[PDB]
Every structure is written in structure tokens, then in C-alpha cells.
Amino acid sequence: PQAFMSNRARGYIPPELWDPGINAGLLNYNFSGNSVQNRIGGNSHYAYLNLQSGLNIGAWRLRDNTTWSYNSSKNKWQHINTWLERDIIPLRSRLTLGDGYTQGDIFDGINFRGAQLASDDNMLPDSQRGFAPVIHGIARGTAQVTIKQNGYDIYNSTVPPGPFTINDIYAAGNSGDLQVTIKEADGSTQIFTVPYSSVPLLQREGHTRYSITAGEYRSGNAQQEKPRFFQSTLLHGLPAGWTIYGGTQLADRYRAFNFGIGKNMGALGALSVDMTQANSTLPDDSQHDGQSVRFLYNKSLNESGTNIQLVGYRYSTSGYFNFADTTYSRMNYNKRGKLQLTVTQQLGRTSTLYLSGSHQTYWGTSNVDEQFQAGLNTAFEDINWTLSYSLTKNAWQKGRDQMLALNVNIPFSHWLRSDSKSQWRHASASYSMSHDLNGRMTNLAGVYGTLLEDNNLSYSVQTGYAGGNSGSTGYATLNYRGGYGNANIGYSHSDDIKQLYYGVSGGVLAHANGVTLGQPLNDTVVLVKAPGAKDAKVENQTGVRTDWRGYAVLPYATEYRENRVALDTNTLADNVDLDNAVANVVPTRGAIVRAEFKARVGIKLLMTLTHNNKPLPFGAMVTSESSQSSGIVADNGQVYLSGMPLAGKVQVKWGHCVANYQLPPESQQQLLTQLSAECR
Amino acid sequence: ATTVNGGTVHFKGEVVNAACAVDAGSVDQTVQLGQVRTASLAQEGATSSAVGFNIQLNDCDTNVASKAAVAFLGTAIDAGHTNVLALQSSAAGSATNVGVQILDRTGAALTLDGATFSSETTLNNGTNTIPFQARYFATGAATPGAANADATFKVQYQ
Amino acid sequence: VNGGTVHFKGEVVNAACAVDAGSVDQTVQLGQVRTASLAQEGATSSAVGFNIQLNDCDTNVASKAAVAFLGTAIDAGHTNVLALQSSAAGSATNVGVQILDRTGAALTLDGATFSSETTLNNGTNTIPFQARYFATGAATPGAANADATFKVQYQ
Amino acid sequence: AACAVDAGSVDQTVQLGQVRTASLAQEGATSSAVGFNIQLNDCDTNVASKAAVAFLGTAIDAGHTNVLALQSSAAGSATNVGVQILDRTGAALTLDGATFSSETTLNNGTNTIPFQARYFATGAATPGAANADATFKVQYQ
Amino acid sequence: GVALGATRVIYPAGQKQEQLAVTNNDENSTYLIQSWVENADGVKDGRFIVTPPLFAMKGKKENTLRILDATNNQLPQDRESLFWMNVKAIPSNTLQLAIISRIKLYYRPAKLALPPDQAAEKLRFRRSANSLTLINPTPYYLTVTELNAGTRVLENALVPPMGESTVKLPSDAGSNITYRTINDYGALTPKMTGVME
């Protein structure tokens, strides 16, 4: 049966096909400079240089980050983060020695310096990611199952006469209704429906996530100390829509244990309740024991796909502290209750009301932190207009703190024709109007778009008026994303302040085949190598072209996925023909994979060959050793060859021809040449 | 020979620690997702290849603001899928049952509400870049066409 | 405290249907020729049915794609009979293979296309066709494997 | 005296403008220097040929006697920072009243002497107002 | 089974090369792809040369066919020109099936008096006895799908630019006529009605 059969998920890639990468260096540079001129104090210069070095040897990936600052009066190199990451396939996890961060959701975000080992959800196929119910069933006889959503079908497959479990259902949003319909050739159809609502803490049935972190604690503040701590987090998906998740934080002075459950009740919604019990030592010698209970509720689609509600409550009793409170200085009011209420309502297929309300109460100080936000976005044809309102009454007498904003974006394509050849089609007009509900007014109108053939050079010119002061401000920027780097130039003009920004970003790879420059890198990169094909643009990317050696680096590549690297044959030299214009790679996290391409440099030839006044038979192989070229006879003895010399000979192996040919310089200059040559 | 006394010189100034805002040129941004096929987006939940883009901040100091995050405000195609954007209709023709989604450094989706902020980040002294990923999300079969969507993002400092 | 806006521009393009013909390598098996059975022009054989699946594409584009069969005919009179393509000791004589519609109407091999009437099964779009050996006067004990070409006009 | 100091030199104010704490985060860092000048009128070459300027002010510290102090007010003033005056040659001047600047040859009639004013922060700079004042003596040989 | 990148390839005038993808979804399949281009009458033509004309594809792979022009600007520049691009996948007792896929190649002149958007609406219907002829004043090849004459579909139609295509009509059909044309990307324009002008 299907349940016993080791069926694989949709989009599943075996771990053997995953490419570890290549042994190569790496250096990403980001230089920025600001010249600020004011009538009061003349002029000044600022320069910030971010340098991320790296080295990928074997499977280990070493990364180092450094910063340089120069003001106009000294040079200051400053380390930030160094880490040696790696991925372990048998454990389906990722290990990191050195600096890093704690991705804990059950606990609070912590920056640390030590060994971390955490399960990664990215290595799993995209089908079985997130939360989605798995379907268990018994089918009497051979059956056809059509797990179908309220809109359309999702999973259609055959099932043998036996138990079957289906776990390939996609996320399909936060809430959904799956109708399982089984049809057998003998009996009548059997249908049953199941609703589901998801919470980020929930996991799939039989899904396990873990995180083990150990090492010292680091923070930007110099007041806090650097204590060593251990943090373990576990998330498990029980059968029947439950989730059990726990955690443990431990240090010299702070010991906290977190336990929680979550449920997918179906039509009612989704729930997640957890309790954290902590014994802490304050900056002084005092010891405090406390608890904090967090509650999360997600309602299903109210009405008919109109309203969605989220309720997040958190009650922290007197004596519960996070890790920062303990790790404060040797000598340096808790939250009684925090409530979040989010309501989203969609109307007219266009307007989307978002209402957010946060309400926090402390201990002793009965002051209440209230935060009410109401946004309305509407996309009426090309015109997109958003109206937002916000209010914030905080504990420290922040008053009403009301704010209102109105942003309208109108593309020029609303007026220009569909097939306009002008560059004005790649542009839009933006208008922003901000009230502070006290007379403080900010208007800003401008245009922006792209004006290059690859849409690399992006321009944005905006004027604005600030009124109580009455200030007119101009702001014009140009960003160019070329095949060697990104260069941005900006000019901000004010009443008495003139700012000129100039920045260059780039990346350098010291791979085996020399040094390759390119756009700034983003974790995983693909090194496209097509030697002999100079200035060849790659597809689906902006301003990524090969250099004079044919080597280029792609900025971003999806990890553990099937992504296509294609060379745009249209914008390629007529003398060069690619044997393969599309390649497929499966990179690992933080890895450099070579998408090797073969390019023939000689002229493109179309030869009609005849033997004994008879065209060569179909399927015959024509090869030329003078320039290592090959082709297959199409019909009437017509064969296509790429990369051939002006004068030479070819040989045909139908099942042993030799054919001599010569071409004129006009033929060599032509794009594609056609000729005839007889066998021996 | 002779030493006499002049007047006085009065120096007027003010030492100020400056805050930070969005980098020039990163205010209005455009991202080209490329070309995707119905084979890639043929059923609900199918996602295309993510395209990276960064938001830059300049003149940020650790003392004034240790951490920062952003929140994207947009239009949802339906109340069920509130974490995906909505594509605008075009005269030539707009794709049906498809939208734009935004991810984080952790690979998690973002609620398009104006208050759901993303994960916190550490602010380096000066230039700071926050990366994000744009993706295609199909709710059912995706008819071919042109997909263009817009999103408004606001930044908070902690 | 405040930011700007980001826009995403892209294209979603339709893809032509992927055509799968019966088993792997676009091969459909047929029963062996019976010398006693294949005697007269009207003599036929067992009707082996196969199906063609137009997968990895939308049902709307799949259903609008015209369908036709073509190839070589053994004789001018036998327009609907494929000519057997075999040059060996296993080549049979005075036989052919016929591709047949659902109801039982013979399919012309000239190339006159028609609608596809794809059945939208639970999996994908499918179209069933029929194949049977056809005698034209005599039978020979040989492997009469033939070849036919399938034409799909994506309207 | 051999020369006359104009009012625009006797009583005038020079503004250094706002600066960034990053530009003065560490000790020894200096901000951008602005330029002012003092005008001498009716200068007689026969009476005197060389002119010099000595600056008198309040030094911040005994170890740093070339930096003026801040006398804005009793509160809301920048800390661990001062202002500096550089002569024509670009060197710092001692705030002692007898430490004169570089000797400059005097031309008959009207002459000008340019000086630069900049910031100088020890330790770590802190936000706040920064105001200073200093008296000077001119010597004619 | 091989598949093409698009069901409708538009080749603008003035260029030299057009790119079309051919992909093999089957993991274990060896194929020989042979491609060519014919005119509107189904006759093999040398006006467009597809490179490589014949190549061997092994396993799951995607390759690019480059359509190279040879018109020498001899085609009319007033209206679109129609060609058929054929791709045939040879699967290199049992009969073997070779699949031919034919797609529509539109040689589109660079400068045209009408944008593609307005071409869909400006179709006229001349109805008569057993005839529902379609007039297309617009200079674009129009593909009319599910032409319903009130309550019954007639058939798919392809009306040439500045042309009058003919479709037979049973007398039982109603007066109301509804249709919808296929746009560039292959989707279906929302249904319009057809006037009798």
C-alpha cells in the first residue's frame, strides 16, 4: 500500500545531488561616502567601508566582518562577527562555531558567541514545510484520491487497496478546508472534509525541530557582562493536530524552563498556550522566582473570506525576568500584561483594513501603554493608495502621539500605451502626505523608475515641503547595478544643508580559475563560467554579465532547490555559439557552485553533404577534429556545425566520409554561413 | 617692539549625536522578479525562485538605536492569504491567482499589516543593510500575464 | 521612523503541454500477428488501446490544442493504414497497423487535424486512442513494427 | 601701536557648526576646521616689520594646554571636548599669553592674518552645546 | 515528453535571433529534437533557420533554440506575418510515436498603427444565412475562442489582419454573440460581446 511504500514528497531532491560547492575565497566590499556642506560649519567628509571576508574550503564556510570609518580623522579597523558554519546532512541540521544569534521563538532573541547546532527547515522539500494536515486513510480496493481545496484540486493520486498517508499538502495559507474524495472503480465515492488553521508554533504531524546553543553572551551595550549560557529548544508535532514544544535556558544566575502546547481545532481556529518558569538573580544578590504565561489564538475566516483575527496575550507575574535583566551590570517594573489584537478585513476585492491594538500594563505603575493602528490599502487599477492612522499613549507621558499618512503611487503606464517605445513606461509618480495632527505637515512628490536597457540604472527624483518652519528639500538618486558592482550617487538639497552620497558595492571570488569580480553577494552564489564568451548576459537577473574572461557571479541563488541558470543567447556575440544555454545546479547554504558552460568560438556553419550524388542518411554524425565540433545530419544531408575554422575538413560516420571546405572572409564575417561539400 | 591687546574671539557651536533614516535611493525601490511558468506555479502553495533585495540605512549609531526592524504594508488578495501581496490590473492583462510574498533572513513570511514588524537586527555604527527576499505565491492555477505589485515599508528603531 | 515603498515587476508566461504517449519511449505494445486470422482485407486483430497525456499544462490551453495523426500509407487505397517500417528478416508482408478513434472510426493519416476533446481526469488531460493490426490479403510471421507521427497544434 | 585692528576683528563671532560624535569618538580626533581672519589697518613698515599674535584662554587640562575650554553654561554643555586655534602654518597655539604665533611680514596699509578654528575631543565625545572665548595680544616689531 | 517554453512566439522585426526553450520533464528519456519553421500554408521554408536544427537531449534537460532571421526585409511591414514553428521529438513488435508540436510565430513589424490591447475589441461580425463571418480591421492575427452565438459554440477561429474569416452557423442560433480572444501571453481576455457592424 501507499503508506508502506516509501513514497517521496513533491519536489524532493536526494541529498547526494546536493552540491557542497568549491574551494574558494570571497570578499564583499561596501564603501560609502557622504560629503555634507552647511553654511554654518563649512564642509565635512564621512566614509564607511564594510568588508566581509570569507573562505569556503571543503564544507566549512568561514566568514568574517570588519568595518572602517574615516571622518574629516583616523583609521579604525573594527571586527564585528566571525563564524565557521557548516551543514550536517545525516542530522539534517546546521552547525555554527563562533559568533551568531539565537533564532529562538519560544524564548527571546539572544546574540551569543559559541557552538550552535540547529535543525534547518530549508533542507526539507518545499511541499512538506510549514503546517498542513496529513491525511490517513484506508481504501477498500484500488482508489483515486483527490484532496481538493475549496477553490481547486490540490493532490490527485492513485492509492492501492490498503492504508495510505499523504503528507505533501502545501501550506495553502493560514486557514483552509481540505476535502478528501476517494473514488473506487467498484463502490461509490467517499468524501470527508477537514478544516485547519495554523500558528507559527504548530508543526506538521511527525515533524521535529531542535536547537542546542552553548557559549558566552554578547550584546551591544557595554554595561552588560558576558556570562556563559546554554539554551535548548524543542518543537514536536504530535498526532491529531497537536504540538508539544519546550525549552531550557541556563546560566550561572538564571534558570528558566518553558513548556507549551498547541492545537489545530479546525473550524474553531488554532491555539497555543505556554508557561515559562524562571529563577533569576538580579544585579544585586536578590533572588527572584516567577512565571509568565503566553496565550495565542488565531480565528478562522469569519463571514466568507472577509475577516481574520489574532489574539496574543501574555501575563508575567512579579518575579519573572528575561536573560538580559539577569545579565545587566553588577549594580543597575515588570510587565503585568500585554495584549495584542489584530483584525484584518478585506472589502471590495481592493481595500484591506488592518487594525492593530497593543495594550500593556506594568507592575506598581498603573500606567498603560496603548498602541492603536489602522491602515487601509487599495489598489484601484494602476493607482495604489494607502491611508494610515496611528495612536500611541505610552507610560512616560507620550500624550496622544497621533499620526496620519497618505501615499499614492501612479504609474505612467496608466496613460502611456501598452506598446510604447519611450522610456517613460518604466516610471511612476509618488505622492506622500503626512499629518502629525498638530500642524506638522510633510508633503513629498516625485518620480522614479529605470532608464537603461537592462533596467540597471534606476533614478529617483523627489521634491518635498515641510511645514510647521517652511523647508523645501530636493532628493535625487541614481543606482547602477552593473556586471562589476553597484554604484549609487545621491544628492539631498535642503535650505542650508547639501549632502552628496557616493557608494560602491562589489564582490570578489578568488576561485581556481583566477579572480572574478561581480555584484555584491548574498549567501549562496553561482559562479557562471563560459570561457570564450565575453559580455554574455544571464537570464532572469538585472545587470549580471560575464567579464572579458567569461566568468561572472550571480548575487543570489536559492538553497537546496532546483534553480535554472540560463545565458541570454540574444545578447551574445554572433561568433560564439553555446553548446548548452541552460544549466541546473543545487547549491548548499553558503556555497559557491560552478555552472560550467561550453562555448564554441568559430563561425556558425550549415553544410550540405552528399555521398555519390546522394544526400547523407538521417542521423549520421558529422565531426571536425580541427576545432572539436560535432553535429547530426538533419535532412537532405544538412548538418549544423559550431566553432569551425575558415578552411578545413569534416568526417561523417553514418554507420567514413572526408569532406574538404573553404570559406571567404565575407562568409566568416556573416552571421551564419551555408555551403555544400561532397564526401570522398 | 610693542605688545598690545586686541579683542576677543567667540566660538559658537554644538556637538550633536545624529540619528539615522532610510538611505538615499532605497526609499523607492524596484525589483525584477523575472519570468515564471505555470508549471512552477500550477497549484496552491507553489512558490517561485526568490529574488534578493536589501534595505540600507546610513549614519546609524549604536548608542541612539541598538536594534531596528521593518514592517511591510500592502494589499492582500484574500483574507485567507494575508501574508501575500496583490498584483495590480493592467491594460494588457493581469495574471490571475498569483501574488508577491516577502521573506526574511530566517526564511519566514511577513504579515502585510502595518504593525507586524520583522526580526530584530544589530545596528553597526554607520551603514547597515537588511536583506529580504521577494517570491511568487500562487493560490490555485496561475493564468499567464504580467504581475506588478507594490508594498509600503516603515522602520522602527529600538 | 518612516520609510518608503518597494515594487515588484515580473511576468508569468504560459507553457506548452508535455505530451506522453503510452508507456516509456513513446512505445505502445501490440499483439503478435496471427497468420490464420490475417487472411482477407477485412481481417483484423486484437485492439490494443493506449492513451496520450498532455501534462504539465493548464486544462484551458490543453483543451484548445488541435490533434492529428500522420505518417506513411502502405497503399493509395489504404489511406488509414500505416505502412510497416522494418528492413530485416523479421519484416512481414501485406500487413499494416491502424490507429482508431474511440467509437471505431478510422483515422486519416494525411494530417487533417481536429479538436482534442481532452478528458480531464483526476490527474491531467488524457486522450485515448486505439491500435490494431490490419491485413490486406496475406500474413507473414514477422515483427511488423511501424511508426506514426503525432501532431499537436497549440492554438 | 604700529597697526590698527578693525572692529570686524576686535569683536566678531565665528561659528563652527554642528559636528558628529563619530568624528570625535576617540581621543585626538578633530572635526573640520573653519577659517576666520584678523585685519590690521594703517600698518607702518618703518615702525614695525614683523607681526605676531598670542592667544590667552582657559586650558582644559594641564597635559593639554593647547585646547580652549567650554564656558557655555552650568548645564547642558558638551563634555570632554574643546576647541583649538591653528595659525597660518597650521600648528596649534599655546593658550599662554606670551606664546605668539608665527612672525608675518607686514605690508604698508591694510594686512590680513588668517587663522583656523577646529574641535578637539579627548576620550569619548558627548552631545551638548560648545561655546568658547579667548583674548589675544598682537605684537609689532 | 518534451515541452515548449510558450504556445505563442512573437518575433519583433529588425532583430536577428529569437530564443525559445525546449525542456524534458522525464528524468529517464533519450530524445532527438528536430525543429523547423514553415509558412502559413504548411510548406517548409528557409525564411527562418532554427539552430540547432537537430540535437540529442539526454535525461531531464532544458535547451535553447535560436530562430535566426533570413527575411532580408522582404516581408510586408504593414501587418503581422504568420509562421508555424514545428518541434518533433524522436524517441531514440511495437510502434513508436514521434510527437510534433506546432506553435505560432508572429513576425511583428516594429511600427504598427494600433497597440495590441485595442485589437481585441475591434472585431466585427457579419451574420447571414449559415455564415457568421468575422471582419478584423486591426492589423493583428486574432484568435477567437468559444465563439458562442447565444447558446451554442461554433468553433475556434483565426482571423487574419484586415481579413474576413468565414464560419458556418446553424439557423437555430440566437442573435447575441459572445467571444473572447487570446492575448500575447496565452491567457484568455475576459468575454466580450460582438456587434453586428
Side-chain angles (χ1 to χ4, degrees), chain E residues 118-133:
Chain E
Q118 266 82 10
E121 61 153 340
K122 263 178 291 307
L123 199 156
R124 302 285 90 100
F125 286 83
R126 273 260 320 289
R127 86 203 53 196
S128 296
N130 54 79
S131 66
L132 201 73
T133 48

PDB file of all heavy atoms in Angstrom, chain E residues 118-133:
ATOM      1  N   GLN E 118      -6.014  47.251 -28.053  1.00  0.00           N
ATOM      2  CA  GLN E 118      -7.246  47.630 -28.733  1.00  0.00           C
ATOM      3  C   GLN E 118      -7.623  46.683 -29.864  1.00  0.00           C
ATOM      4  O   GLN E 118      -8.732  46.797 -30.396  1.00  0.00           O
ATOM      5  CB  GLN E 118      -7.127  49.052 -29.281  1.00  0.00           C
ATOM      6  CG  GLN E 118      -7.662  50.126 -28.352  1.00  0.00           C
ATOM      7  CD  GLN E 118      -6.666  50.516 -27.280  1.00  0.00           C
ATOM      8  OE1 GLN E 118      -5.500  50.127 -27.331  1.00  0.00           O
ATOM      9  NE2 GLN E 118      -7.121  51.289 -26.301  1.00  0.00           N
ATOM     10  N   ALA E 119      -6.737  45.761 -30.247  1.00  0.00           N
ATOM     11  CA  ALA E 119      -7.039  44.876 -31.367  1.00  0.00           C
ATOM     12  C   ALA E 119      -8.111  43.856 -31.011  1.00  0.00           C
ATOM     13  O   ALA E 119      -8.811  43.360 -31.901  1.00  0.00           O
ATOM     14  CB  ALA E 119      -5.769  44.167 -31.833  1.00  0.00           C
ATOM     15  N   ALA E 120      -8.256  43.529 -29.727  1.00  0.00           N
ATOM     16  CA  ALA E 120      -9.223  42.511 -29.331  1.00  0.00           C
ATOM     17  C   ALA E 120     -10.656  43.006 -29.490  1.00  0.00           C
ATOM     18  O   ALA E 120     -11.530  42.256 -29.940  1.00  0.00           O
ATOM     19  CB  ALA E 120      -8.963  42.076 -27.890  1.00  0.00           C
ATOM     20  N   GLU E 121     -10.919  44.260 -29.122  1.00  0.00           N
ATOM     21  CA  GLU E 121     -12.287  44.765 -29.124  1.00  0.00           C
ATOM     22  C   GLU E 121     -12.793  45.093 -30.523  1.00  0.00           C
ATOM     23  O   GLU E 121     -14.001  45.016 -30.770  1.00  0.00           O
ATOM     24  CB  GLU E 121     -12.392  46.002 -28.231  1.00  0.00           C
ATOM     25  CG  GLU E 121     -11.522  47.167 -28.675  1.00  0.00           C
ATOM     26  CD  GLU E 121     -12.073  48.509 -28.236  1.00  0.00           C
ATOM     27  OE1 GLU E 121     -13.282  48.586 -27.931  1.00  0.00           O
ATOM     28  OE2 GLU E 121     -11.299  49.488 -28.199  1.00  0.00           O
ATOM     29  N   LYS E 122     -11.903  45.460 -31.445  1.00  0.00           N
ATOM     30  CA  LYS E 122     -12.321  45.952 -32.759  1.00  0.00           C
ATOM     31  C   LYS E 122     -12.427  44.792 -33.749  1.00  0.00           C
ATOM     32  O   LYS E 122     -11.751  44.731 -34.776  1.00  0.00           O
ATOM     33  CB  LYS E 122     -11.361  47.027 -33.253  1.00  0.00           C
ATOM     34  CG  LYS E 122     -11.834  48.446 -32.989  1.00  0.00           C
ATOM     35  CD  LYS E 122     -10.816  49.468 -33.465  1.00  0.00           C
ATOM     36  CE  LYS E 122      -9.561  49.426 -32.614  1.00  0.00           C
ATOM     37  NZ  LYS E 122      -9.880  49.544 -31.166  1.00  0.00           N
ATOM     38  N   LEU E 123     -13.316  43.860 -33.418  1.00  0.00           N
ATOM     39  CA  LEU E 123     -13.683  42.761 -34.302  1.00  0.00           C
ATOM     40  C   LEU E 123     -15.168  42.886 -34.607  1.00  0.00           C
ATOM     41  O   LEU E 123     -15.976  43.070 -33.691  1.00  0.00           O
ATOM     42  CB  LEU E 123     -13.371  41.405 -33.665  1.00  0.00           C
ATOM     43  CG  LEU E 123     -13.267  40.191 -34.593  1.00  0.00           C
ATOM     44  CD1 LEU E 123     -12.411  39.116 -33.960  1.00  0.00           C
ATOM     45  CD2 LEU E 123     -14.636  39.630 -34.933  1.00  0.00           C
ATOM     46  N   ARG E 124     -15.526  42.788 -35.882  1.00  0.00           N
ATOM     47  CA  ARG E 124     -16.908  42.944 -36.302  1.00  0.00           C
ATOM     48  C   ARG E 124     -17.461  41.619 -36.811  1.00  0.00           C
ATOM     49  O   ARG E 124     -16.726  40.784 -37.342  1.00  0.00           O
ATOM     50  CB  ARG E 124     -17.035  44.016 -37.386  1.00  0.00           C
ATOM     51  CG  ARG E 124     -16.523  45.383 -36.962  1.00  0.00           C
ATOM     52  CD  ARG E 124     -17.495  46.066 -36.013  1.00  0.00           C
ATOM     53  NE  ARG E 124     -17.217  45.757 -34.616  1.00  0.00           N
ATOM     54  CZ  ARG E 124     -16.559  46.555 -33.786  1.00  0.00           C
ATOM     55  NH1 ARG E 124     -16.093  47.728 -34.179  1.00  0.00           N
ATOM     56  NH2 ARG E 124     -16.368  46.167 -32.528  1.00  0.00           N
ATOM     57  N   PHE E 125     -18.767  41.434 -36.640  1.00  0.00           N
ATOM     58  CA  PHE E 125     -19.448  40.212 -37.047  1.00  0.00           C
ATOM     59  C   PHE E 125     -20.475  40.543 -38.117  1.00  0.00           C
ATOM     60  O   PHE E 125     -21.366  41.369 -37.892  1.00  0.00           O
ATOM     61  CB  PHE E 125     -20.125  39.537 -35.854  1.00  0.00           C
ATOM     62  CG  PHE E 125     -19.169  38.866 -34.917  1.00  0.00           C
ATOM     63  CD1 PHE E 125     -18.511  39.591 -33.942  1.00  0.00           C
ATOM     64  CD2 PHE E 125     -18.927  37.509 -35.013  1.00  0.00           C
ATOM     65  CE1 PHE E 125     -17.631  38.975 -33.079  1.00  0.00           C
ATOM     66  CE2 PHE E 125     -18.048  36.890 -34.154  1.00  0.00           C
ATOM     67  CZ  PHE E 125     -17.400  37.623 -33.185  1.00  0.00           C
ATOM     68  N   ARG E 126     -20.354  39.897 -39.271  1.00  0.00           N
ATOM     69  CA  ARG E 126     -21.335  39.990 -40.347  1.00  0.00           C
ATOM     70  C   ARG E 126     -22.084  38.662 -40.383  1.00  0.00           C
ATOM     71  O   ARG E 126     -21.534  37.639 -40.801  1.00  0.00           O
ATOM     72  CB  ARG E 126     -20.663  40.297 -41.681  1.00  0.00           C
ATOM     73  CG  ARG E 126     -20.465  41.779 -41.948  1.00  0.00           C
ATOM     74  CD  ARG E 126     -21.546  42.321 -42.870  1.00  0.00           C
ATOM     75  NE  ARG E 126     -21.877  41.387 -43.940  1.00  0.00           N
ATOM     76  CZ  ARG E 126     -21.085  41.104 -44.966  1.00  0.00           C
ATOM     77  NH1 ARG E 126     -19.904  41.683 -45.110  1.00  0.00           N
ATOM     78  NH2 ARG E 126     -21.492  40.222 -45.874  1.00  0.00           N
ATOM     79  N   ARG E 127     -23.333  38.683 -39.930  1.00  0.00           N
ATOM     80  CA  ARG E 127     -24.153  37.484 -39.875  1.00  0.00           C
ATOM     81  C   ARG E 127     -25.056  37.411 -41.097  1.00  0.00           C
ATOM     82  O   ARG E 127     -25.499  38.436 -41.623  1.00  0.00           O
ATOM     83  CB  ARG E 127     -24.987  37.458 -38.591  1.00  0.00           C
ATOM     84  CG  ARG E 127     -26.310  38.206 -38.672  1.00  0.00           C
ATOM     85  CD  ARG E 127     -26.810  38.621 -37.295  1.00  0.00           C
ATOM     86  NE  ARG E 127     -25.806  39.368 -36.547  1.00  0.00           N
ATOM     87  CZ  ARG E 127     -25.853  39.586 -35.240  1.00  0.00           C
ATOM     88  NH1 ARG E 127     -26.851  39.132 -34.500  1.00  0.00           N
ATOM     89  NH2 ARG E 127     -24.875  40.277 -34.662  1.00  0.00           N
ATOM     90  N   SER E 128     -25.302  36.192 -41.562  1.00  0.00           N
ATOM     91  CA  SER E 128     -26.190  35.945 -42.690  1.00  0.00           C
ATOM     92  C   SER E 128     -26.654  34.497 -42.602  1.00  0.00           C
ATOM     93  O   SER E 128     -26.476  33.834 -41.575  1.00  0.00           O
ATOM     94  CB  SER E 128     -25.491  36.252 -44.019  1.00  0.00           C
ATOM     95  OG  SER E 128     -25.165  37.627 -44.121  1.00  0.00           O
ATOM     96  N   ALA E 129     -27.259  34.004 -43.679  1.00  0.00           N
ATOM     97  CA  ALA E 129     -27.651  32.604 -43.726  1.00  0.00           C
ATOM     98  C   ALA E 129     -26.416  31.716 -43.666  1.00  0.00           C
ATOM     99  O   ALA E 129     -25.479  31.885 -44.452  1.00  0.00           O
ATOM    100  CB  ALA E 129     -28.452  32.319 -44.996  1.00  0.00           C
ATOM    101  N   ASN E 130     -26.425  30.769 -42.723  1.00  0.00           N
ATOM    102  CA  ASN E 130     -25.340  29.820 -42.475  1.00  0.00           C
ATOM    103  C   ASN E 130     -23.956  30.453 -42.579  1.00  0.00           C
ATOM    104  O   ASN E 130     -23.043  29.866 -43.168  1.00  0.00           O
ATOM    105  CB  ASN E 130     -25.447  28.612 -43.419  1.00  0.00           C
ATOM    106  CG  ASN E 130     -25.507  29.004 -44.883  1.00  0.00           C
ATOM    107  OD1 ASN E 130     -24.488  29.317 -45.499  1.00  0.00           O
ATOM    108  ND2 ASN E 130     -26.708  28.992 -45.448  1.00  0.00           N
ATOM    109  N   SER E 131     -23.785  31.641 -42.002  1.00  0.00           N
ATOM    110  CA  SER E 131     -22.499  32.322 -42.036  1.00  0.00           C
ATOM    111  C   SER E 131     -22.457  33.374 -40.937  1.00  0.00           C
ATOM    112  O   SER E 131     -23.413  34.134 -40.761  1.00  0.00           O
ATOM    113  CB  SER E 131     -22.248  32.972 -43.402  1.00  0.00           C
ATOM    114  OG  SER E 131     -23.168  34.021 -43.642  1.00  0.00           O
ATOM    115  N   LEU E 132     -21.343  33.414 -40.212  1.00  0.00           N
ATOM    116  CA  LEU E 132     -21.114  34.371 -39.132  1.00  0.00           C
ATOM    117  C   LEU E 132     -19.752  35.030 -39.299  1.00  0.00           C
ATOM    118  O   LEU E 132     -18.930  35.062 -38.382  1.00  0.00           O
ATOM    119  CB  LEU E 132     -21.233  33.706 -37.765  1.00  0.00           C
ATOM    120  CG  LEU E 132     -21.508  34.652 -36.593  1.00  0.00           C
ATOM    121  CD1 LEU E 132     -22.943  35.147 -36.626  1.00  0.00           C
ATOM    122  CD2 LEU E 132     -21.198  33.977 -35.266  1.00  0.00           C
ATOM    123  N   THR E 133     -19.503  35.567 -40.493  1.00  0.00           N
ATOM    124  CA  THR E 133     -18.157  35.973 -40.876  1.00  0.00           C
ATOM    125  C   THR E 133     -17.591  37.014 -39.916  1.00  0.00           C
ATOM    126  O   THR E 133     -18.309  37.865 -39.386  1.00  0.00           O
ATOM    127  CB  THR E 133     -18.155  36.529 -42.300  1.00  0.00           C
ATOM    128  OG1 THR E 133     -19.219  37.476 -42.446  1.00  0.00           O
ATOM    129  CG2 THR E 133     -18.342  35.407 -43.309  1.00  0.00           C
TER     130      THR E 133
END
